[PDB]
Amino acid sequence: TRKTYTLTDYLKNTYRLKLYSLRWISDHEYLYKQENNILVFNAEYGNSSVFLENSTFDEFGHSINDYSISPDGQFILLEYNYVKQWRHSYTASYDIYDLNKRQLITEERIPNNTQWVTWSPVGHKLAYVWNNDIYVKIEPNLPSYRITWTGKEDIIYNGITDWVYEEEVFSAYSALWWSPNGTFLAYAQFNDTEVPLIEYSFYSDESLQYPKTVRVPYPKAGAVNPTVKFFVVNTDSLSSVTNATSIQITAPASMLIGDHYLCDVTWATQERISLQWLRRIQNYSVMDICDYDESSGRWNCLVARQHIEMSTTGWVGRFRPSEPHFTLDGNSFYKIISNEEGYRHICYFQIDKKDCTFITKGTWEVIGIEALTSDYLYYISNEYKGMPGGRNLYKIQLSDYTKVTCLSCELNPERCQYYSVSFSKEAKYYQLRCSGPGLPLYTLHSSVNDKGLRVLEDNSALDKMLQNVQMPSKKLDFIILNETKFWYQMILPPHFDKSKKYPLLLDVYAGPCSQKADTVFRLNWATYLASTENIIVASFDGRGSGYQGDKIMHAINRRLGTFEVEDQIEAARQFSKMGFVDNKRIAIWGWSYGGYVTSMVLGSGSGVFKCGIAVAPVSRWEYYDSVYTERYMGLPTPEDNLDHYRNSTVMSRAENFKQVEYLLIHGTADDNVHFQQSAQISKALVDVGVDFQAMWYTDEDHGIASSTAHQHIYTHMSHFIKQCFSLP
Amino acid sequence: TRKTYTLTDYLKNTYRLKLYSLRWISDHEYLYKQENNILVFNAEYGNSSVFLENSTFDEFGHSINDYSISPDGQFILLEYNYVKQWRHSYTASYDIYDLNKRQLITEERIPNNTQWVTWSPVGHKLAYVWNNDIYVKIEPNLPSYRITWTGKEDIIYNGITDWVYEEEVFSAYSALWWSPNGTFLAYAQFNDTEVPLIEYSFYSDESLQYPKTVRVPYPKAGAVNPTVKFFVVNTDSLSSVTNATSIQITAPASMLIGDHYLCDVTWATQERISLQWLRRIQNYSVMDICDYDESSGRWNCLVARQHIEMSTTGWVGRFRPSEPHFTLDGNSFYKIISNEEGYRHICYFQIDKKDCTFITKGTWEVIGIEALTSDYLYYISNEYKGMPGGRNLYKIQLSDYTKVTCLSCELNPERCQYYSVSFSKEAKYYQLRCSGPGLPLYTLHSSVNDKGLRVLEDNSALDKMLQNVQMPSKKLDFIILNETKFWYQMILPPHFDKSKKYPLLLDVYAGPCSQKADTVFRLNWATYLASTENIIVASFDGRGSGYQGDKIMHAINRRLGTFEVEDQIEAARQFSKMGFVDNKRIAIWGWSYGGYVTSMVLGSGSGVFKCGIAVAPVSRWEYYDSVYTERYMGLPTPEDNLDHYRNSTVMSRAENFKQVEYLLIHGTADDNVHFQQSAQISKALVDVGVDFQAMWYTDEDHGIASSTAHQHIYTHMSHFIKQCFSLP
């Protein structure tokens, strides 16, 4: 009898998924690390050489966390002393290695506690942020030129984002953008002077006598937001003037009338930059296209080149307005936007004409634009077989839109339905990354003829190991509600028998534009629960979920905590009707937005669920950040949406928790969903005399990802589920 | 057939003990509140009169928290807007009502947010503290005189104690001491300028968007301590034109050489005051006796009147140096101190004589001196029947110490073995308060011939109710360890059957000088556990426990976390050998110091306990406060006792928790034992891969006493214990 996928297998990662992460360094070569060696591969023939021997930094005296080669291949940036911060930010020490001279640069080194560093797109210029100010080095071993002097900890941020811009606007810590050939350096400055601070304790190692109080500018819903300014400096003039002037580009008058955000920066040409602004009420955005004026050294944005993007049914974009992709001459661009039917498709714009032309259409959506050449635009969409949870690469002829070729659909249809791609510098080659429904498969292709060059990684090793294991299966299907298809997936135990009644765990997220039903292959907790514990783990994408049009995504607009919660309850009822579910053993769990929905469901009084687990849940929208929260909920004021803000809390349903078994878990150093949110849920439950289980994770953040805490939490949750389901 | 004492009975206080709290106002009468009416009683006859009508303040507008009648009966201080702070501190609003003119005073009223107020011992002067400064009022309706001007929140405290002095030195918020007839007002001033602050979050009501950060000057072991100064001001010579002059009394040179504390202030006469000072290394204390010099208007303390008190085996006093009891002329005094055998007895001192004479002796201890007349000194001791957990009132003839008479021993030996007493102004009468083993009994007596005048409250109503309940019994006995007897008690289930095996729960505290085995009657969680769940709840007093001499009490000097922990394991080991104990079902629980011991026991690897519960436990002594910790542990420096500080932590024993079920509980707003202590325990358990149960209580402090949290924690612990014992 073959073994099953156990909890230890998951926690110890015994069955390792192999990947193939390469880095294109040109149009035909990429770097790949093999046995601590950095090899350089020739895409066309597959032959390689050692780019950097694994013994090169044997006596560096530090464990290098990452590396970065300058565009011209002349230098390499070594990143060590990695100190993680929020989702994208972190601190680290850096050194530069001269690849030619084979020597490490010892003079004019990058300061310690450098917040961010990036090479120019061409050559080897460097721009870094230290103590919240920007610095530029023209040459690795020469003195830096300071660009800003206003930097101030927790107050003024030059070239780097503050907490909310990093998490909800740019999904990056960096707030600087080199022009194409590196002449100009554009950047944002955030002023958090009046932004309130979230404060919480951090206990650290046992040796610390007094706990530390972490304080970070974080605007909760309705609070004072950071303000922002945008500047551009000509780095080619740094060595000619004592103090290069940073030219400011002000936001349009339509944004200056109230609170707003800078939400996108994209260079079009060497002398043209585009900027998108968004009003605090996120249903109105404006894009300016600004040109450099060589006579005045100023940047002007003609209103005739300004583009407006608004929404009547919801917010703009899936999570933010989409980025433009400019043609080489910078006179036109492509952008994904929802058409009249509510589906996101590619629209082609002339920079000085307000009406665009849609180049794709249908009841499906474009996920992203991956590359643009003079003749073709490549994009990922879920058009194939009408499966919103599948992803494929397409190519569309710019001179004939009716000519669309799917480059991945038929490669291996049974094994591969979820693709991501990585093109070489000029898109001469591309690596396809299939991530499901079968084992991940990595392949290399030539763009000139769209022919497969070779398989990079097929995971044959893992496929071998998994042969001796009773793996669960995955079903992806839909149910029809009110004339609309809603998708769901089920992780089914081995030897699934439709004549039996299995206990069911509903795995939920359900936030706006989420997708929990897809064709991706995962080896996770649910794998163990179905394989070893014979539990069916299901997920459902109801109203509010994405990639299926605005009618579904915008259904929860200004109404979080309603339809997405109700549809989750209805999904369980539907799974009951299927006949293979033990109606007495239905559970539900979720993390983050999922914890909120789980909590809301457990407190609904539906009687459908026996127990539930919420990990780091939101409990009341006024405790979460402004950018994310207000995007869907508007403002928490009586003139706007305060009533629904007050009606959608977990605390107001405390009394109904008397009907279920609940486990509440939260990391004490959660900078994202503050521990405060669970502190208020537990206090509300205590106040109405409701018993429940709880677990705090000291110094863990929203991810509860430290090695030990990760194993501990999944171990704790397993006992709770097994107990609720009366499982040995 | 009849009902048992349920968990609901404990939580809802179904069965209440009646009390009889009286307030002596003279040597012949006392005040007693009945039906919200304050009556005045004549001790000799028991007849009374209404002192103040309950309706008198029917339209007052505010809910009165407490009242305080001036010594002369002319005025009454009304307390309202009560807002609790730490163990003893709180702020409130006050109003004074004239009893003669039957009118509430409206001019020059005490400010709101007053920190402390007190009538002079005679007459009706008032002294109060507000905004950390002292004020005096000669007449209730007249303007007050500012005494101090240095008051500064969290920095300078005049007339009130800072956190550590409140909790560990004076067990009171007040740091004001009126002379016997009200002429002088002595006070202490604390300076916490360099004391680090403990910081933690307070979440408050759901409506608070951002958690508040509470900051409290709190010195952890080894940290910078507050400094102190002592002053005396003449309140009879206050001027409305000039600022009052306070005369400072400096500490002796033997104290000024290093860190020290003021630990006692006791007036001897109208013009003589005594102060005891304690070195930071708490085994050396000094008493100064100071006389007022009418010539210079200064206070002088003759070295010839200095009295040193030291210990070679441990610290000085039970928790601090005992207070002196001066004779009428103030020329001599009585004080409890450890004799050469290490037993605490009464010593008689001459103010200018170095040697004192012990007036009691034996292998038992005097608990406290209660009253002193020219012929007798009255005290409470545990001498009767050699039972350290029993308390009786005795009087000793000052002219012949061989004449000792027990005044409570034989009143009712079966019902009463634990007394407390309250004497009238000149010891003419005394109230005896028996609290066990039977139901509390309150009686009034006259000193001249020790007559038992009358029964004030015998709890006959409760007795009648408890007749219909299957109440548990209590066994108080002892076991021998190395020729030494150590006492224990067991709460035994109704109809106890020695032929059956009962699960056992060890209720532990075990801190230095603690006593958990006594003759006191209690209705608590243990009552329910034994009565309804049939669990034996035992407690044991091992090394380090009090009232049995220093040999036992000082055995843990500089060694906390050792013998007192080993002894609890030894006791349980012995109980597990008894025929009526199920050795497969033995648990342990404790709160505060008891939580620490429970945790150290559980992590000892003894294998005797199946499960355990720790509530707000200390986990590392360096996290607890200086005054308490250093008293027993010395300083945490390599030259002193750092090594034992480092290996007496719970965290270091994490690995040993693998074989036990552990429940860790802590309030997030605990200002005493910071949540930090439990946060470090959970992290250490997570780090070694040990699963456990936890529960935090949002905004609850060390007492977790709010009505809802109290019910919730005991409800939660009950489920844990029953589950551990496989009880329905």
Ligand SMILES: N[C@H]1C[C@@H](N2CCn3c(nnc3C(F)(F)F)C2)CC[C@@H]1c1cc(F)c(F)cc1F
């Ligand atoms: N704050 C939210 C940010 C969001 N991003 C989507 C886009 N993105 C991200 N990373 N990278 C990108 C992308 F590159 F796609 F832009 C994450 C993911 C969910 C996050 C979220 C939502 C909650 F309701 C909550 F309670 C806690 C929480 F954490």
Ligand SMILES: N[C@H]1C[C@@H](N2CCn3c(nnc3C(F)(F)F)C2)CC[C@@H]1c1cc(F)c(F)cc1F
């Ligand atoms: N900090 C300690 C103060 C102590 N006092 C004893 C004498 N006393 C008190 N109040 N009033 C009086 C008396 F009037 F008797 F003097 C309390 C009681 C135990 C307290 C304590 C000890 C710990 F190890 C701990 F971890 C937490 C904790 F809280």
Ligand SMILES: *[C@@H]1O[C@H](CO)[C@@H](O[C@@H]2O[C@H](CO)[C@@H](O)[C@H](O)[C@H]2NC(C)=O)[C@H](O)[C@H]1NC(C)=O
């Ligand atoms: C991969 O192999 C190619 C050819 O197979 C290498 O190209 C070299 O091209 C130069 C042209 O001046 C010739 O002199 C060499 O003889 C070629 N090499 C070989 C092996 O024929 C290319 O350099 C190789 N790339 C890597 C990364 O190894």
Ligand SMILES: *[C@@H]1O[C@H](CO)[C@@H](O[C@@H]2O[C@H](CO)[C@@H](O)[C@H](O)[C@H]2NC(C)=O)[C@H](O)[C@H]1NC(C)=O
């Ligand atoms: C960041 O924003 C703050 C406003 O919140 C600016 O501070 C003001 O500066 C003006 C001009 O010096 C002063 O008169 C005000 O007193 C300041 N207000 C506050 C609340 O501090 C600050 O100058 C901005 N910083 C930058 C670099 O733009």
Ligand SMILES: *[C@@H]1O[C@H](CO)[C@@H](O[C@@H]2O[C@H](CO)[C@@H](O)[C@H](O)[C@H]2NC(C)=O)[C@H](O)[C@H]1NC(C)=O
């Ligand atoms: C480089 O130029 C900038 C901009 O003029 C200087 O920054 C100003 O500095 C003055 C005086 O220190 C302040 O009053 C202004 O508020 C600053 N403006 C800005 C935008 O920061 C900067 O000091 C100059 N650096 C040097 C070395 O001269």
Ligand SMILES: *[C@@H]1O[C@H](CO)[C@@H](O[C@@H]2O[C@H](CO)[C@@H](O)[C@H](O)[C@H]2NC(C)=O)[C@H](O)[C@H]1NC(C)=O
């Ligand atoms: C990168 O682009 C910039 C901007 O177009 C180039 O700089 C201009 O170069 C022209 C010469 O062709 C000069 O007449 C202008 O004065 C320059 N303008 C600015 C703002 O510098 C730059 O030469 C390009 N860099 C490279 C390496 O080609």
Ligand SMILES: *[C@@H]1O[C@H](CO)[C@@H](O[C@@H]2O[C@H](CO)[C@@H](O)[C@H](O)[C@H]2NC(C)=O)[C@H](O)[C@H]1NC(C)=O
């Ligand atoms: C309280 O005691 C003080 C001190 O003994 C009394 O004040 C003294 O009274 C005598 C006689 O009237 C004066 O000569 C002294 O100068 C006073 N000394 C001081 C320091 O004031 C006071 O009278 C007593 N109060 C009461 C109410 O009996």
Ligand SMILES: *[C@@H]1O[C@H](CO)[C@@H](O[C@@H]2O[C@H](CO)[C@@H](O)[C@H](O)[C@H]2NC(C)=O)[C@H](O)[C@H]1NC(C)=O
């Ligand atoms: C009070 O206790 C302290 C500490 O136990 C004693 O001081 C010294 O403590 C160190 C260890 O910390 C020993 O090595 C010394 O032998 C102790 N004695 C001296 C003089 O330093 C101190 O002796 C105690 N005081 C009394 C009166 O017993």
Ligand SMILES: *[C@@H]1O[C@H](CO)[C@@H](O[C@H]2O[C@H](CO)[C@@H](O)[C@H](O)[C@H]2NC(C)=O)[C@H](O)[C@H]1NC(C)=O
């Ligand atoms: C208790 O009883 C005594 C005597 O029965 C009361 O009487 C004494 O005080 C009264 C006023 O307080 C006087 O009217 C009596 O003359 C006086 N009698 C004696 C012998 O002194 C006494 O007040 C009563 N006390 C209370 C508190 O009610």
Ligand SMILES: *[C@@H]1O[C@H](CO)[C@@H](O[C@H]2O[C@H](CO)[C@@H](O)[C@H](O)[C@H]2NC(C)=O)[C@H](O)[C@H]1NC(C)=O
């Ligand atoms: C309270 O104590 C502090 C010292 O703990 C006194 O100030 C002293 O310490 C300051 C720094 O902590 C020094 O800068 C000062 O020179 C020193 N002396 C003075 C007069 O400040 C402070 O004065 C004390 N306050 C009171 C009212 O006694």
Ligand SMILES: *[C@H]1O[C@H](CO)[C@@H](O[C@@H]2O[C@H](CO)[C@@H](O)[C@H](O)[C@H]2NC(C)=O)[C@H](O)[C@H]1NC(C)=O
């Ligand atoms: C302490 O606070 C109370 C409550 O504010 C004061 O009482 C008055 O309350 C009325 C209405 O509640 C207000 O109109 C007044 O402003 C308050 N003050 C006065 C003087 O009327 C009270 O007076 C305060 N006491 C002191 C000594 O400051």
Ligand SMILES: *[C@@H]1O[C@H](CO)[C@@H](O)[C@H](O)[C@H]1NC(C)=O
């Ligand atoms: C590179 O270093 C690794 C150690 O991580 C070693 O095993 C390997 O043999 C080295 N590369 C080659 C080509 O030997």
Ligand SMILES: *[C@@H]1O[C@H](CO)[C@@H](O)[C@H](O)[C@H]1NC(C)=O
């Ligand atoms: C960085 O700081 C470390 C720690 O003091 C020091 O050893 C090193 O010399 C510094 N390096 C640079 C480039 O500043």
Ligand SMILES: *[C@@H]1O[C@H](CO)[C@@H](O)[C@H](O)[C@H]1NC(C)=O
């Ligand atoms: C944006 O949202 C607000 C609030 O719902 C609404 O009043 C306004 O009309 C919207 N603007 C657009 C362009 O739809």
Ligand SMILES: *[C@@H]1O[C@H](CO)[C@@H](O)[C@H](O)[C@H]1NC(C)=O
């Ligand atoms: C005082 O009020 C109480 C209610 O609080 C009432 O029961 C009692 O009768 C009143 N006192 C008198 C003497 O009536």
Ligand SMILES: *[C@@H]1O[C@H](CO)[C@@H](O)[C@H](O)[C@H]1NC(C)=O
């Ligand atoms: C009393 O002392 C304070 C503080 O030193 C001072 O401000 C005040 O004016 C003084 N009053 C008189 C009457 O001297």
